[PDB]
């Protein structure tokens, strides 16, 4: 009833390559909360071209 220490330790190539539909859909609270330095630094062409007003 124990684990065979010499069993297959590799990764089964014929495993599940799709996405798990029941996986975590929530937002991860302890994720990256800082800004990204290599984000988009250029102005947006399709931004607001009018007044506030």
């Amino acid at each position, epitope marked *: 009833p124990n684990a065979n220490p010499n069993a297959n330790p590799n990764a089964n190539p014929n495993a599940n390559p799709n*996405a*798990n*539909p*029941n*996986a*975590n*859909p*929530n*937002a*991860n*609270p302890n994720a990256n909360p800082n800004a990204n330095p290599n984000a988009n630094p250029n102005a947006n062409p399709n931004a607001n071209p009018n007044a506030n007003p």
Partner: antibody
Amino acid sequence: QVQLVESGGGVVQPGRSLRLSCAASGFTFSNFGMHWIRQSPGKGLEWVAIIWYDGSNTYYADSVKGRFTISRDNSKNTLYLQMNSLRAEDTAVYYCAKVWFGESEDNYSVDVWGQGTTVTVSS
Amino acid sequence: DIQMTQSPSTLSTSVGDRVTITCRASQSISNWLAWYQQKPGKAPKLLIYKASTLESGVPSRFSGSGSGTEFTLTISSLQPDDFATYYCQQYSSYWTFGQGTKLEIKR
């Protein structure tokens, strides 16, 4: 506490379209995935659709795939379901539901259900 | 598509009784099973997830058991607020609900 309010249901002729909405309050709506689940006397409880917190992944039941479209507006804290090409068997009470918070590798389902809105497809 | 089946469909019981309802899946769903309670004309409420974890706020007289393909929900001592319909739901592969068991007041 958590509160979900459905609206938009009513009587619709077969073949027409209908848009259901679900207003969420009492929690950070943009942080949670949502389900739409319907209930009819003939089929019982029946899952319809699921959407990720950011809308990146959506899934649909096989009986509705290609006809229903689930979306969300996180700026308005509103969940939407656009239903096209309605058939008679789609008459049911539709609930929106909130996914519970869990561990990163667990499977997920819903913990809080909305009030429910009735949709009647009849000519 | 995993089929779910609940037994019995209707159970006549009395206040104070020990109630046990069963739920079976067409294939192995591990422990990813939830139990929902629904009162008539009202929205369903979550009772148990992972087949045996009690939802916060649920009284301790509710308990879950089971693994693989057979699962049971047990109410140790029935109280009048517990007369409702109970649905099981696998969430191992998409989401499918059982037909539901309605607890009826025996007289």
